[PDB]
From a paper:
The most frequent PTM reaction catalyzed by FIC enzymes is the addition of AMP using ATP as a cofactor, coined AMPylation or adenylylation. Enterococcus faecalis FIC belongs to class III FIC proteins, which are comprised of a single FIC domain and carry an autoinhibitory glutamate in their C-terminal α-helix. We discover that EfFIC has both AMPylation and deAMPylation activities borne by the same active site. Furthermore, the conserved glutamate implements a Ca2+-controlled metal switch that tunes the balance between these activities without conformational change.
Numbering used by the authors: 5 to 207
The structure:
């Protein structure tokens, strides 16, 4: 267990560590967008996801953007055992992304893979939007996706991706250059994970 800022700042409370982590990474997410850096990276690849994860969590989480060395025990959900991860990430890279069916299937596959130690959800929600922006000229208006519905559809996706597919298509917007949709979407993505201390636009 190693979070680069826990021993740097006197952090004794998990709530305080979670507070610093959200603040620092939200500032990184803001810069990723405004610098235009978000639009100069490989779309729908592990290389692309790795870039986002490292950009958000460098200096916060150890091995940011790097593939994990052990298995994930987050709930009863079956993430890919680490022995399958090299093969899994190569398959996802080669998966087609022509339409919503193909894009959702790809996203479900990346959610199962969960290649990093932690922050898989937040980095893959940004990654997804970039596939939608490039291939459909759409993004998700995350304000149209309720938290409880989102998690339920995600738990179900290894069996059937129909529920998550609906949530995304119904939330799709053509306002791909709308800064507020991106910023609000960052706060919602963090809310799905229990981080509500800050509003990235106030950073």
């Amino acid at each position: 267990h190693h979070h680069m800022l826990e021993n740097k700042l006197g952090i004794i409370n998990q709530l305080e560590l979670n507070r610093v982590e959200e603040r620092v990474s939200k500032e990184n997410a803001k810069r990723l967008y405004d610098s235009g850096d978000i639009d100069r990276i490989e779309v729908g690849t592990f290389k692309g996801l790795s870039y986002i994860h490292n950009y958000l969590f460098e200096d916060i989480y150890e091995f940011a953007g790097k593939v994990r060395s052990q298995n994930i025990s987050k709930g009863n959900f079956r993430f890919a055992p680490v022995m399958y991860l090299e093969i899994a990430l190569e398959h996802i890279d080669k998966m087609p992304q022509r339409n919503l069916d193909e894009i959702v299937a790809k996203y479900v596959e990346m959610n199962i893979a969960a290649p990093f130690r932690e922050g898989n959800g937040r980095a893959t929600r940004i990654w997804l939007d970039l596939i939608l922006k490039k291939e459909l000229k759409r993004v998700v208006d995350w304000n149209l996706i309720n938290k409880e519905d989102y998690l339920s559809a995600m738990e179900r996706s290894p069996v059937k991706d129909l529920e998550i597919k609906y949530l995304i298509s119904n939330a799709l917007t053509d306002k791909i250059n709308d800064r507020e949709i991106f910023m609000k979407g960052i706060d919602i993505s963090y809310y799905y994970e229990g981080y509500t201390e800050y509003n990235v636009d106030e950073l």
